[PDB]
Amino acid sequence: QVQLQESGGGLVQPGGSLRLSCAASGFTLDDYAIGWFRQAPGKEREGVLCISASGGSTLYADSVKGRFTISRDKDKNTVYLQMNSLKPEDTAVYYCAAAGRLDLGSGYVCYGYYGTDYWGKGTQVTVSS
Amino acid sequence: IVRFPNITNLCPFHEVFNATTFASVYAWNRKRISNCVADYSVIYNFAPFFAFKCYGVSPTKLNDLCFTNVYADSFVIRGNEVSQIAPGQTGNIADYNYKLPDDFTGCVIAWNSNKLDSKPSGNYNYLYRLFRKSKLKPFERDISTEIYQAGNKPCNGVAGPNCYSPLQSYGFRPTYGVGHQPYRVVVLSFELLHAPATVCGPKKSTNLVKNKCVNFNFNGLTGTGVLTESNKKFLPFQQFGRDIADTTDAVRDPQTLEILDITPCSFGGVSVITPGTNTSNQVAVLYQGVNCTEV
Amino acid sequence: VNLITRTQSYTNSFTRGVYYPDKVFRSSVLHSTQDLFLPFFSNVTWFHAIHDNPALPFNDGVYFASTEKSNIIRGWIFGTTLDSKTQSLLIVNNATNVVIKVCEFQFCNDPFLDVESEFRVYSSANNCTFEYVSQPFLMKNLREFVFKNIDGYFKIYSKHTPINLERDLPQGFSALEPLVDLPIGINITRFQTLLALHRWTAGAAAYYVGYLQPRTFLLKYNENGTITDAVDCALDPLSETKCTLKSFTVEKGIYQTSNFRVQPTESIVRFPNITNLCPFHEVFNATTFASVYAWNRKRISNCVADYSVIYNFAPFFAFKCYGVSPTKLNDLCFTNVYADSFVIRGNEVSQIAPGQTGNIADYNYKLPDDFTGCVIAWNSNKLDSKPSGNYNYLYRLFRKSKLKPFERDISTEIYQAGNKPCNGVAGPNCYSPLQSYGFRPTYGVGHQPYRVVVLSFELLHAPATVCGPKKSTNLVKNKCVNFNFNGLTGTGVLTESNKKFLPFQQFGRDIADTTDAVRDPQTLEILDITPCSFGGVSVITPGTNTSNQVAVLYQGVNCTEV
Amino acid sequence: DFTGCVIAWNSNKLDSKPSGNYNYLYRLFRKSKLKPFERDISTEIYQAGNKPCNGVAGPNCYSPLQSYGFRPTYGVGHQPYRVVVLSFELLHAPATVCGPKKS
Ligand SMILES: *[C@@H]1O[C@H](CO)[C@@H](O)[C@H](O)[C@H]1NC(C)=O
Ligand SMILES: *[C@@H]1O[C@H](CO)[C@@H](O)[C@H](O)[C@H]1NC(C)=O
Structure with missing residues (x-):
């Protein structure tokens, strides 16, 4: 029922721009924290960026702060990623992931990192360098 | 003989009783079933439960009554909170997730879900x-x-x-106690005969007989009569058609569009002709106004 | 946008609009029924729209007719005011299906189809209650439809007839066949019809609209069950003879059809005698209010209670009454009034109500749970409060x-x-x-003193004495009029009674166990009663094979009164 | 064709226990x-x-x-009730039951 499919990518020169989007179909959780992940060949996959679902509290990683822009639209239940000024170390296998929000301490808190329920097939983003 | 309407659809109990996923208790899934024949004997073959739990009706008496609409509410709850699924219950689920009117006329089926809703890490989607x-x-x-x-x-x-x-x-785990195992619960609610009913069992309208004096209860109409073929052109959507005496004479069938005629069964009076009692005991019997073939 | 204009001509109804009253088959018999129909030879508004106030009233039912062949007409809307403040019907036709909705849509001044959108029809739907989908109805021709709403049930009948090149409605007969029934159950006082125009483009349309009345009809079924003729029962006396005799032919002779009476026109008001006025000024404002434990009680009778001037006596907000209404106290008449004035606490103002318990209720002042009267409470902090603290109460x-x-x-x-x-x-x-x-001017709102006056009214068990100044307009002297006298409902033509009703007498019984003299309590006048003029009607006519001319004879009445 | 007297009184005060009464x-x-x-x-x-x-x-x-299931916290229709019914056999045989009428 729940499926995560991504679109976009390719090979661009350094300093270029790309648009990546992963569409969530059949999602039913009321509160959830979807995340985007990347994994270069030879390195462990790590969290990149995520925002809250209720109001959109944006969070970023240090290495992609500013250069990565995200937006979540509830009309299509699809999250869109904007990347500009791409650099050679950004070449990796990029994935989209979806997971529910943690419920501890009687509050609404969105958590990423590991422990993700669902994942996408992934895409390849390469920099000519 | 008796009457039943034209229902040929089969109620879809397969999708509701098993769909490899269940909605949460706070947001219970509700489906309306109508305009179909419901076979409640196949429910046992879809879910691994023990026995029915009905209040307004009996589990063995669901294939006879005809209802207008059927409502099915499905969710998954904890093992010990199944007791809270009862009329006039009090508890977290009773007053915060699902409330039932005290005049509930329906059934509730709950059965364990430890093999699908439990994970070694711990289920958290409910x-x-x-x-x-x-x-x-x-x-x-x-x-x-x-x-x-x-x-x-x-x-x-x-x-x-x-x-x-x-x-x-x-929190669902395979090592948890019985009262903490996840349980799938489905509550079926019925509506009585307020509108033309649409859900009941498929018993023929007694395979309409012909050329015989017959008792009948046609749609609440109790009586007797002889039924024959018809030569009258009832317009597309007539159900009963009367005479000068304002009593029915030509009729349709709610299980098959056929036009039939009604006559009263033959009857008459009996007269006895005797000589004087002081003369002899021999008598003669006469049936008034009847041909000497039926008697 | 306003882009359509409309003109209205008028024509006769001839003999059209007879629908199968019940879905029952008969054969070669005449049936008399009572239901809604279009009375024959009635009034028809030929509407012609061209590219406007499409606010056409609905009444009880509607008969619609059209002769266009381009399928320009589509759907209908029904409602009572047709705004977002109330629900309305959304029967819209389509070449594929038909959809009906009930919701508080916002229709503009002229809903129409863009053609395939209905945004101009309504902006949005907020609180919807019913939806329905089915097979469409509409499929050189004359198309007739009859819509009605009885007992919350919406029923449509229709007929498509072939017509030659004829300017007006053709004669003959054509039955209407039922198509649809739905359970809507709302009030609908008017209706509108929608048109579809491509884009815009010029267009024209014409139709006929009529309203129906509940009448008694007679219908003749042929040997196949199709209606070929019908007879009205309230068109002309000959039709009444046909309805009574239950046949389509009347032979030479004299027949009796019905009776006639003179209808009442007005009503007569006879209140109790009036000489004085009630002293309301000595209760609400006397610079003294009795204690709650020992409350005063004043009896008010034999006077007019002007509750309108009560607002000018005390600075209260409004009345609150249980068995009566504050604005309707000037019409109902009571034999006795009781006034109970006292002073209570601010929080104790809520403690005067049937079915309530409190320290004041069960120990100081109690009223029956069937109390019929009013209670008026107003703050008196400027008179019952002292800097040292009031102690008398x-x-x-x-x-x-x-x-x-x-x-x-x-x-x-x-x-x-x-x-x-x-x-x-x-x-x-x-x-x-x-x-x-303990009353102080520095206390709170709930602790400030409050003056409460309770007025209790006694129902009509004894001769009434207290009510408003209703004029006893004399019922002229020669009018067939009804009369309501202290629960007695009657009718007749009523003169002044010369009878000598001795002061104790108030009603006069005739030989036939009925009143023939009545009494007005306002002024001691006894009134004579006779029945309104009435009689019978007969029809004299030769055989129907000769002519339809008839003569009407009224029995026992000269040509001076109807 | 019943003819007789019926006396019904709620007995929730004695037929109800905190654990739930299954006596009937x-x-x-x-x-x-x-x-x-x-x-x-x-x-x-x-x-x-x-x-x-x-x-x-x-x-x-x-x-x-x-x-x-009888409990004291249940609804009025769910409370237990005690009913005593008296039925009379009328005069067909020598009557045996009646009040103290002096001969
Ligand atoms: C039709 O309606 C008009 C408008 O009131 C009226 O003046 C006219 O007399 C009516 N026609 C007939 C035949 O009554
Ligand atoms: C009635 O039907 C028969 C055949 O079904 C036909 O011959 C006859 O003409 C019909 N009646 C009329 C008045 O047309």
Whole structure:
């Protein structure tokens, strides 16, 4: 029922721009924290960026702060990623992931990192360098 | 002989009783079933439960009565909270997730789900409401998610002091006790004969007989009569057609569009002709106004 | 946008609009029914729209007719005011299906189809109650439809007939066949019809609209069950003869059809005698209000109670009444009025209501749960409060049992709450069941003193004495009029009674066990009663094979009154 | 054609316990309806299927004896009630029952 499919990518020169989007179909959780992940060949996959679902509290990683822009639209239940000024170390296998929000301490808190329920097939983003 | 309507559809009990996924208790899935024939004997073959639990009707008496609409509410709850699924119940689920009117006329089927809703790490996709300002009204659900406030100061969108989240994630494990195992619950509610009914069992209209004096209860009409073929042109949607005496003479069938005629069964009077009793005991019997063939 | 104009001509109805009253087959018989129909030779508004106030009233039902062949007409809308404040019907036709909705849509001045959108029809739907989908109805021709709403049930009948090149409605007969019934159940006072125009483009349309009335009809089924002729029962006396005799042919002779009477026109009002006016000024404002434990009670009778001037006596907000209405107190008439004025606490103002319990209720002042009257409470902090603190007001605190309705307690003593007798000394387990109210101008709203006046009205069990100044307009002297006299409903033509009703007499019984002289309580006048003129109607006519001319004879009445 | 007196009083004060009173049972299933003023004490496994029940309450095997649940917190219609009914046999034989009328 729940499926995560991504679109976009390719090979661009350094300093270029790309648009990546992963569409969530059949999602039913009321509160959830979807995340985007990347994994270069030879390195462990790590969290990149995520925002809250209720109001959109944006969070970023240090290495992609500013250069990565995200937006979540509830009309299509699809999250869109904007990347500009791409650099050679950004070449990796990029994935989209979806997971529910943690419920501890009687509050609404969105958590990423590991422990993700669902994942996408992934895409390849390469920099000519 | 008897009457039944033209229902040929089969009610879809396969999709509701098993769909490899269940909605949460706070947001219970509700489906309406109508305009079909419901076979409740095949329900046992879809879910691994023990026995039915019906209040307004009996489990063995669901294939005879004809209802207008059927409502099916499906969810998954904890093992010990199944007791809270009963008329006039009190508890977290009773007044915060699912409330039932005290005049419930239906059935409830609950059965364990330890082999599908339990994980070694721990299931967390099922949540139930914990805090609510007021008790839930009958047949009412809550979907809105917000930050519950139990203090004078506003929560202001931050779960600080006197700020809580009324959505607790269920903890399901394969090593948990029986009262904590996840259980699938389906509640079926029936509507009595207020509108033309649409859901009941497929018993023929007694395979309409011909050329015989017959008793009958046609759609609540009790009587007797002789039924024959018809040569009258009933317009597309007539059900009963009367005479000068305002009594029916030509009729349709709610199980097959046929036109038939009604006559009264033959009857008459009996007269006895005797000589004087002082003469002899021999008598003669005469049937008034009847041909000497039927007698 | 406003882009359509409309013109209205008028024509006769001829003999059209007879639908199968019941879905029952008959053969070669005549059936008399009573239902809604279009009365024959009635009034028809030929509408012609061209590219406007499409606010066409609905009444009880609607008969619609059209002769266009381009399928320009589509759907219908029904409602009572057709805004977002009330629900409305959304029967819209389509070449594929048909959809009906009920919701508080916002229709503009002229809903229409863009053609395939209905945004101009309505902006949005907020609180919807019903939806329905089915097969469409509409499929050189004359198309007739009849829509009605009985017992919350919406029924449509239709017929498509072939017509030659004829300017007006053709004669003959054509039955209407039922198509649809739905359970909507709303009030609908008017309806509109929608048109579809491509884009815009010029267009024209024409149709006929009529309203129906509940009448008694007679119908003739042929040998196949198709209606070929019908006869009205309230068109002309010959039709009445046909309906009574139950045939389509009337032979030479004289027949009796029905009776005639003179209908009443007005009504006559006869109130009790009036000489004085009620002294309302000595109760609401007297610079003195009795204590709650010992409340005053004033009896008001034999006067006119002008409740309108009550607002000018005390600075209160509004009345509150249980068995009567504050604005309707000037019409109903009561034999007795009781006034109970007292002073209570601000929070105790809410403690005067049937089915309530409190310290004041069961110990000071009690009223029956069937109380019929009004209560008026107003703050008096500027008169009953002192800087030192008011001390005159007292209220009872202890009592052995609850007070019965309309019971007061004034007797004082030393309440005993112990086994030993009090012996007249307030020592241990001996208290005083009378505490003084503490009133100060610096206290809160709920602790400020409040003056409460309770007015209790007695129903019409005795001769009435207290009510408003209703004029007893004399019922002229020669009018067939009805009369309502203290529960007696009657009718007749009524002169002045010369009869000598001695002062005790109020009603006059005739030989036939009925009144023939009545009494007005406002002025001691007895009135003579006779029945309104009435008689029978007969019809004299030759055989129907000769002519339809008839003569009407009214029995026993000269040509002077109808 | 009943003629007689009926006296009913709520006895929730003595027939209700905190644990729940199951003292009273009712028959739920029966092959045929009951004649007037007839009881039924016989207890057996009701059979609702073609196969015999064989004394085992399995499939299509029910118990026509269901225990009542009486509690003091239940609704008025759910509270236990005690009913005493008096029925009279009229004069067909030498009458035996009547009040103290002096001869
Ligand atoms: C039709 O309606 C008009 C408008 O009131 C009226 O003046 C006219 O007399 C009516 N026609 C007939 C035949 O009554
Ligand atoms: C009635 O039907 C018969 C055949 O069904 C036909 O011959 C006859 O003409 C019909 N009646 C009329 C008045 O047309």
